[PDB]
Write a protein that binds this ligand. Structure first.
Ligand code: CHL
Ligand code: CHL
Ligand code: CLA
Ligand code: CLA
Ligand code: CLA
Ligand code: CLA
Ligand code: CLA
Ligand SMILES: CC(/C=C/C=C(C)/C=C/[C@@]12O[C@]1(C)C[C@@H](O)CC2(C)C)=C\C=C\C=C(C)\C=C\C=C(C)\C=C\[C@@]12O[C@]1(C)C[C@@H](O)CC2(C)C
Ligand SMILES: CC(/C=C/C=C(C)/C=C/[C@@]12O[C@]1(C)C[C@@H](O)CC2(C)C)=C\C=C\C=C(C)\C=C\C=C(C)\C=C\[C@@]12O[C@]1(C)C[C@@H](O)CC2(C)C
Ligand SMILES: CC(/C=C/C=C(C)/C=C/[C@@]12O[C@]1(C)C[C@@H](O)CC2(C)C)=C\C=C\C=C(C)\C=C\C=C(C)\C=C\[C@@]12O[C@]1(C)C[C@@H](O)CC2(C)C
Ligand SMILES: CC(/C=C/C=C(C)/C=C/[C@@]12O[C@]1(C)C[C@@H](O)CC2(C)C)=C\C=C\C=C(C)\C=C\C=C(C)\C=C\[C@@]12O[C@]1(C)C[C@@H](O)CC2(C)C
Lengths: 212, 41, 229, 205, 207
C-alpha cells in the first residue's frame, strides 16, 4: 500500500480498511481502538465542512471580479449585520438551537447506531437509521439521489474520493486563513496577484511570513 | 494511547488538572463579577 | 451494441436493457433498481415537456409574431388575469399529475376512468400509458419507442441553448440561427470571450433585471454571469 | 370498495362496514375500536347538526335579498347573534341548555350501554325497539323509513353531511377572510370568477 | 418505548413501569423503591397545581388582552398580589395554612398507611374514601372516569402536567425580565419574531 513517507511501514495498529488510509499517525493517536472510530468521524465531518467552506470562500471572491458587489469571506460577517434587519443575538441563538439539534442527534447515532430512526421522531424510520458506517448516514434526506445504494464497488471508490478531496479542502482552507492574515486580501485576489506578477507577489514578499 | 490515558488518570495528575479548572474558573468569575462580598446582585 | 462512445466499456449494471441505453453513466445512478425506475420516469417527463416546449418557442417566433420569449405581453393579450390562470393551473395539474404519479409507485390502480368505466388498458409500462393516450400509433414497433427518447434527449439538450443564447445574445432561437450563417466565424461565444492568463473578456447579458409587469418587481437576473466565459 | 385515493395503503381497522367508510384515516387515528365507535357517532351527530345548521344560516340570504320575501333581515347570519328576539340571553340560553341537556343525556345514555334503556318514557311508553345507537327507529322517524334501503341509504346521509360540514367551514372562512355572506360571495365570484378568488381577494398586500 | 433522547440509557433502576416514564433521571434522585413511590406523588401534586394554577395566569390576562369583554381585575398574574379587599393578609393567610394543612396531612398519612386515611368511626361523618393508592378516586373522580381508558388517561394527565409545570416556569422568568404579561410577551414575539426573541434582552445578552 502506498504509504506516506515511502520506505517505512505503517503503524502496526492501522493497516486496516479505512477510506484513504495511508498509514499516517505520527503521534499515534489512533492507538486506542475505541477512539479511532471517533477520529474517523471527526475527519469526515471536518472534511465535509471544509469542502463547503472552500467553495463558500472562493465563489463570492470569484464573483467579485465581474463586479456584483459581494464581500470577501472575511468581513462578510459585518456586511450582513451592517445591513442587519435581524439582530445578531437572534441569529447566533437560532444557530445553537437548530444546529445543536443535528449534532446532538448526529452523536447518539454514533454512540448507539440502533436508535435515531427506530421511529418516533415524526416517523421517518430508515431515513435516519444510518447505513452502519461511522460518518455515513445514507438514507432518504441525506442521500436524495439514491447513490451509495447500487454497486458497492463503485461506492467504496467514492468514499476514497470524498476523503482525499476533503483532506485537500482542509489543507487549502488552512491557506485561506494564513494567507489572509499576511496579505490581507481575498483568496481569488491572491490567485490573480500571483498569476499577474508572480515574482514580487510570492510568499517571501508579504513582509509577514518572512520577518527581518 | 491506552497507557497514556492510564497515566493521566493517576492521582496527582487529576489533582493538578482539576484544581487548575477550579482555580481558573474561580479566578475568572472574579474577572467579570469583581469584589463579591455579599450575595446582593 | 452501439454506445455513446464507440470504444467504451459500458458500466456493469447497465446492459442492453432499457429502451435506448447507450451505456452512459459517469456517476452510476442506475445501479439502484428502485431509483433508476424513478429516474426512468423523469427522463420521459423532462423530455416530453421540453419537446413540446422547444417546438413551442420555434413556432412562437418564425410563423408567429416576433418577440423572443420573455413576454408576458402577447397578442393573445392576457385574456383572464394571471392569478386567474395560476389558480386554475394548480388544481388542473394537481389532479392530472398526483394521479399519474400514483401509477408510477403503485401501478395499475388508476386505469379506471373516475366517473364511469371505459378503463384504460392493461398495466403496460408505467411511463407509457396506452389506449386512449396513444390511439394513432404511427409506427407499429418499439423502434418508435427508442425513436422518442433520441428526439427528446436532444430537445432537452437543445432547450438549454435557448436560455443561454437568449441571455447574452438577447435574441430568439431562430434569430441567432440566421445571424450565424451570416459571417459564421463571428458569434460563436468562442470568439466572443477569451479568459486567458491575464486578459478576460465576457459579453454582458443583453436582457436586464427588474422587468416591469403590472407594478411588480420580478428581479429575473441572468444565470450565473460571473462564471461566464 | 371505492377509496378516496385509489390504490392507497388501506388501513386495517377501516375495513369497510360502517356507513360510508372510504378508508380515509391519514393520521392513523382511531385504531382501537372503542374510540372509533365514539367517533363514528360524532361524524353522524356532528354531521347532522351541520346540515340543518348550514341550511339555517343560508336561509337569510335567499329570502331577504333574492325575493325580499317578508323580510326577516338576518344579515349574513350575524345580526342573528345580536338581535331583539324576545327573551334576554340569560333567560334564553339557560333555557336551551336544560331542554337540550335532557335530549343529550338521553342520546348519550343509549350509546353508553347501546343495547339497553332509553326507549320507554313517562306518559306510558314508546318502545319502537330502538336498536342502532347511531339511528333510533320510532317517533324520530315517523313516516316509517328504514324501509329496506339502509346500506344503500345510510351512505347517502353520511355523505351529504360531510359535505354540509365541509361547506360549513367555508362560511367561517368565507366570513372572517372576506366579511361577506354565502350568497354574497357566491355571487361576487360569479361576477368575475377570474379576478375574484381567495388568491385575488385575500391578497391585500 | 419512547425515550427522552432516543439513544441513551433508561437507567437500570428505572424500567418503563409507571406512566409518563421516558427514562430521564440524570441526577438519579429516585433509586431505592420507597423513594420513587414518594416522588411520583410529588410530581402529580405539582402537575395538578401547575395545570390549574397556570390557567389562573393564562386565561384572565388573556380575556382582558383579547378584548374589552370581562377585563381581569388584578391585571397581570403578578399584579393580583395587590387587590386583597375584605380580610387582612395576616389572617387570610393563616386561615389558608390551617385549612389546607388539614387536607394535605390527610393526603400524606394516606401515603404512609395506604388502605384507609380514615376508617369509618374516626373523623365523624365524611370518610367516603373508595381510595386506590397514588390516585384518590372516590369523591375526587365524580363523573366516574377510569372507564377503561385509565392507562391512556394516566398518560394524558402527566404529559399535560409535565408541560404546564415547565410552561409555568416560563411565566415566572419571562415576567421577571420583560415586565410584561404573557400575551404581551406572546404577541410581541409573534409580531416580529427576531428582535422580540429571548437572548436579545438582558439575560443571554450578557453574551
Ligand atoms: C466557525 C467559523 C467562523 C470563522 C472562521 C469566522 C470568521 C470570522 N468572523 Mg464570523 N466566523 C465564523 C463563524 C461565524 N461568524 C458569524 C458572524 C460574524 C459577524 C457579525 C462578524 C464575524 C466576524 C468574523 C471575523 C473574526 C471575528 C473576531 O472577533 O476576530 C478576532 C478574534 C472572522 C473573519 C467579524 C468580521 O467580519 O471581521 C472581519 C464580524 O463582525 N462573524 C456567525 C453567525 C453568528 C458564525 C457562525 O458560526
Ligand atoms: C353554536 C354556534 C354559534 C356560533 C358559531 C356563534 C357565533 C356568533 N355569535 Mg352567537 N353563536 C353561536 C350560537 C349562539 N349565539 C347566541 C347568542 C349571541 C349573542 C347575543 C351575540 C352572539 C354573537 C355571535 C357572533 C360572535 C361575536 C362574539 O361575541 O365573539 C366574542 C365572544 C367570546 C370571545 C366568548 C357570531 C355570529 C354576537 C353577534 O351578534 O355578532 C355578530 C352577539 O352579540 N351570539 C346564542 C343564544 C345564547 C346561541 C345558541 O346557540
Ligand atoms: C434571491 C434571488 C436572487 C436574485 C434576485 C439574484 C440577482 C443577481 N445575482 Mg444571484 N444568486 C442567488 C439568488 C439571486 N440572485 C443565489 C441563491 C445564488 C447562489 C448562492 C446566487 C449566486 C450568484 C452568483 C454566483 C452571481 C450572481 C449574480 C447576480 C446578479 C446578476 C444580474 C445582472 O446581470 O446584473 C448585475 C448585477 C447588478 C447590477 C447588481 C449590483 C447592485 C443579480 C443582481 C452575478 C453577479 O452579481 O455578477 C454579475 C454572479 O456572478 N448571483
Ligand atoms: C476561610 C475563610 C475565607 C472566607 C469565608 C473567604 C471568602 C471570600 N473571599 Mg477570601 N481568602 C481567604 C479565606 C477566605 N475567603 C484566604 C485564606 C485568603 C488568602 C489566600 C483569601 C484571599 C482572598 C482574596 C485575595 C479575595 C478573596 C475574596 C473573597 C470573597 C469572594 C468569593 C468569591 O469569589 O465569590 C463567589 C464565587 C462564586 C460564586 C463562583 C462560583 C460559581 C459557580 C459556577 C456557581 C454554581 C452554582 C450552581 C469571599 C467573601 C475576593 C473578594 O472580593 O473579597 C472581598 C478576593 O478578591 N479572598
Ligand atoms: C341528507 C339528509 C338525510 C338523509 C338522507 C337521512 C337518512 C336517514 N335518517 Mg336522518 N337526519 C338528518 C338528515 C338525513 N337523514 C338530519 C339533518 C337529522 C337531524 C334532524 C336527522 C335525524 C335522524 C333521526 C333522529 C333518525 C334519522 C333516521 C334516518 C334513516 C331513516 C330516515 C330516512 O330515510 O331519512 C331520509 C331523508 C331524506 C330522504 C331526505 C329528505 C329531505 C328533507 C325532507 C328536506 C326538508 C327540507 C328542510 C327541512 C329545510 C336514514 C338513514 C332514522 C333512523 O335511522 O332510524 C332507524 C332516525 O331515527 N335521521
Ligand atoms: C366545497 C364547498 C365550497 C364552495 C363551492 C366554495 C366556493 C367559493 N369559495 Mg370557498 N371555502 C370552502 C368551501 C367552498 N367554497 C372551504 C371549506 C373553505 C375553508 C378552507 C373556503 C374558504 C374560502 C375563502 C377564504 C374564500 C372562498 C371563496 C370562494 C368563492 C371564490 C372561489 C375561491 O376563492 O375559492 C377558494 C376556496 C378554496 C381554496 C377551497 C376549495 C376547497 C375544495 C377544493 C373545494 C371543493 C367561491 C364561490 C372566496 C370568495 O368569497 O370569493 C368570492 C374567498 O375569499 N372560500
Ligand atoms: C399547614 C399547611 C401544610 C402542610 C402541613 C403541608 C404538608 C405537606 N405538603 Mg404541602 N402545601 C400547602 C400546605 C401544607 N402542606 C400549601 C398551602 C401548598 C400550596 C398549594 C402546598 C403545596 C405542596 C406541594 C406542591 C407539595 C406539598 C407536599 C407536602 C408534604 C411534604 C412537605 C415537605 O416536604 O415538607 C418539608 C418541610 C418543610 C418545607 C418545612 C407534606 C405532607 C409535597 C408532597 O406531598 O410530596 C409528596 C409536594 O410535592 N405541598
Ligand atoms: C473545517 C475547516 C473549515 C471550515 C470552513 C468554514 C466552516 C467556512 C467558514 C466561512 O464561510 C463562513 C462561515 C463565513 C464566510 O464569510 C467566511 C468563512 C469563515 C470562511 C477547516 C479545517 C481545517 C483543518 C486542518 C487544516 C487540519 C490539519 C491537520 C493536520 C495536518 C493534522 C495532522 C495530524 O493529526 C494527524 C493527521 C495525525 C497525527 O498523528 C499527526 C497530526 C499532525 C497531529
Ligand atoms: C438539458 C437537461 C438535462 C441534461 C442532463 C444530462 C446531460 C445528464 C446527464 C447525467 O444524468 C446522466 C445522463 C447520467 C449520469 O451518470 C451523468 C449525468 C451527468 C448526471 C434537461 C432540460 C430540461 C428542460 C426542461 C425540462 C424544460 C421544460 C420546460 C419548457 C420547455 C417550457 C418552455 C416554455 O415555458 C417557456 C420557457 C416560455 C413559453 O413562452 C414557451 C414555453 C416554451 C413552451
Ligand atoms: C357542525 C358544524 C356547524 C354547525 C353550525 C351551526 C349549527 C350554525 C348555526 C348558526 O348559523 C346559524 C344556523 C345562525 C347563525 O346566525 C348563528 C349560528 C348559531 C352560528 C360544523 C362542523 C364542521 C366540521 C368540520 C369542518 C370538520 C372537518 C374535519 C376534517 C376534514 C377531518 C378530517 C380528519 O379526521 C379525519 C376525517 C381522518 C383523520 O385521520 C384525518 C383528519 C384530517 C384529522
Ligand atoms: C407547580 C408549579 C407552579 C405552580 C404555580 C401556581 C400554583 C401559580 C399560582 C398563581 O398563578 C396563580 C394561580 C394566580 C396568581 O394571581 C397567583 C399565583 C400564585 C402567581 C411549578 C412547578 C415547576 C416544576 C418544574 C419547573 C420542574 C422542572 C423539572 C425539571 C426540568 C427536571 C427535573 C428533575 O427531576 C427530574 C425530572 C430528573 C432528575 O434526575 C433531574 C431533575 C432536574 C432533578
Amino acid at each position: 500500500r502506498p504509504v506516506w513517507y515511502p520506505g517505512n511501514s505503517p503503524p502496526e495498529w492501522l493497516d486496516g480498511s479505512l477510506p484513504g488510509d495511508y498509514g499516517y499517525d505520527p503521534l499515534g493517536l489512533a492507538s486506542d481502538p475505541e477512539m479511532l472510530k471517533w477520529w474517523v468521524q471527526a475527519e469526515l465531518v471536518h472534511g465535509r465542512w471544509a469542502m463547503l467552506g472552500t467553495v463558500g470562500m472562493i465563489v463570492p471572491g470569484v464573483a467579485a471580479r465581474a463586479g456584483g458587489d459581494f464581500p470577501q469571506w472575511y468581513d462578510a460577517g459585518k456586511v450582513y449585520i451592517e445591513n442587519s434587519s435581524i439582530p445578531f443575538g437572534a441569529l447566533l441563538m437560532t444557530q445553537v438551537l437548530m444546529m445543536g439539534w443535528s449534532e446532538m442527534m448526529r452523536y447518539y447515532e454514533f454512540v448507539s447506531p440502533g436508535s435515531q430512526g427506530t421511529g418516533s421522531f415524526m416517523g421517518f424510520t430508515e431515513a435516519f437509521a444510518g447505513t452502519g458506517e461511522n460518518g455515513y448516514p445514507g438514507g432518504r434526506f441525506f442521500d436524495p439521489f439514491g447513490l451509495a445504494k447500487g454497486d458497492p464497488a463503485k461506492l467504496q471508490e467514492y468514499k476514497v474520493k470524498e476523503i482525499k478531496n476533503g483532506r485537500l479542502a482542509m489543507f487549502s482552507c488552512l491557506g485561506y486563513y494564513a494567507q489572509y492574515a499576511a496579505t490581507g486580501k481575498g483568496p481569488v485576489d491572491n490567485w490573480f496577484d500571483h498569476i499577474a506578477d508572480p515574482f514580487h507577489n510570492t510568499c517571501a514578499t508579504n513582509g509577514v511570513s518572512v520577518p527581518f | 494511547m491506552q497507557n497514556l490515558k492510564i497515566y493521566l488518570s493517576t492521582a496527582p495528575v487529576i489533582a493538578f488538572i482539576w484544581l487548575s479548572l477550579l482555580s481558573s474558573l474561580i479566578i475568572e468569575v472574579n474577572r467579570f463579577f469583581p469584589d463579591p462580598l455579599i450575595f446582593a446582585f | 451494441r452501439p454506445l455513446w462512445l464507440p470504444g467504451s466499456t459500458p458500466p456493469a449494471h447497465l446492459d442492453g436493457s432499457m429502451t435506448g441505453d447507450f451505456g452512459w453513466d459517469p456517476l452510476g445512478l442506475g445501479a439502484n433498481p428502485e431509483a433508476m425506475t424513478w429516474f426512468r420516469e423523469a427522463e420521459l417527463q423532462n423530455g416530453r415537456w421540453a419537446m413540446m416546449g422547444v417546438f413551442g418557442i420555434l413556432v412562437q417566433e418564425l410563423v408567429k409574431p416576433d418577440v423572443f420569449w420573455y413576454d408576458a405581453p402577447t397578442k393573445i393579450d392576457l385574456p383572464f388575469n394571471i392569478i386567474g390562470i395560476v389558480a386554475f393551473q394548480a388544481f388542473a395539474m394537481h389532479y392530472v399529475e398526483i394521479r399519474r404519479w400514483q401509477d408510477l409507485r403503485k401501478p395499475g390502480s388508476v386505469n379506471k376512468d373516475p366517473i364511469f368505466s371505459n378503463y384504460s388498458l392493461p398495466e403496460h409500462e408505467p411511463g407509457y400509458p396506452g389506449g386512449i393516450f396513444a390511439p394513432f400509433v404511427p409506427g407499429d414497433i418499439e423502434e418508435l419507442k427508442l425513436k422518442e427518447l433520441k428526439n427528446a434527449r436532444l430537445s432537452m439538450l437543445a432547450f438549454v441553448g435557448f436560455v443561454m443564447q437568449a441571455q447574452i445574445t438577447g435574441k430568439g432561437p431562430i434569430a441567432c440561427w440566421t445571424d450565424h450563417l451570416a459571417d459564421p466565424f463571428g458569434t460563436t461565444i468562442f470568439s466572443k470571450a477569451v479568459i486567458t492568463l491575464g486578459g478576460a473578456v465576457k459579453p454582458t447579458c443583453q436582457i436586464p433585471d427588474h422587468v416591469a409587469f403590472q407594478g411588480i418587481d420580478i428581479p429575473t437576473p441572468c444565470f450565473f454571469e460571473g462564471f461566464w466565459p | 370498495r371505492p377509496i378516496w385515493l385509489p390504490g392507497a395503503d388501506v388501513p386495517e381497522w377501516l375495513d369497510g362496514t360502517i356507513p360510508g367508510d372510504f378508508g380515509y384515516d391519514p393520521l392513523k387515528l382511531g385504531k382501537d375500536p372503542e374510540t372509533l365507535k365514539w367517533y363514528v357517532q360524532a361524524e353522524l351527530v356532528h354531521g347532522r347538526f351541520a346540515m340543518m345548521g348550514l341550511v339555517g344560516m343560508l336561509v337569510p340570504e335567499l329570502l331577504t335579498n333574492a325575493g325580499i320575501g317578508l323580510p326577516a333581515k338576518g344579515t349574513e347570519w350575524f345580526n342573528a347573534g345580536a338581535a331583539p328576539m324576545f327573551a334576554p340571553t340569560g333567560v334564553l340560553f339557560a333555557m336551551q341548555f336544560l331542554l337540550m341537556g335532557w335530549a343529550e343525556i338521553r342520546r348519550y345514555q343509549d350509546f353508553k350501554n347501546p343495547g339497553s334503556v332509553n326507549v320507554d318514557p313517562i306518559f306510558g311508553g314508546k318502545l319502537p325497539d330502538g336498536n342502532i345507537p347511531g339511528y333510533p327507529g320510532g317517533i324520530f322517524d315517523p313516516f316509517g323509513f328504514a324501509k329496506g334501503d339502509v346500506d344503500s341509504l345510510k351512505l347517502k346521509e353520511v355523505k351529504n353531511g360531510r359535505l354540509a360540514m365541509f361547506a360549513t367551514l367555508g362560511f367561517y372562512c368565507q366570513a372572517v377572510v372576506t366579511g361577506k355572506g354565502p350568497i354574497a360571495c357566491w355571487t361576487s365570484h360569479l361576477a368575475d370568477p377570474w379576478a375574484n378568488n381567495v388568491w385575488s381577494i385575500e391578497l391585500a398586500k
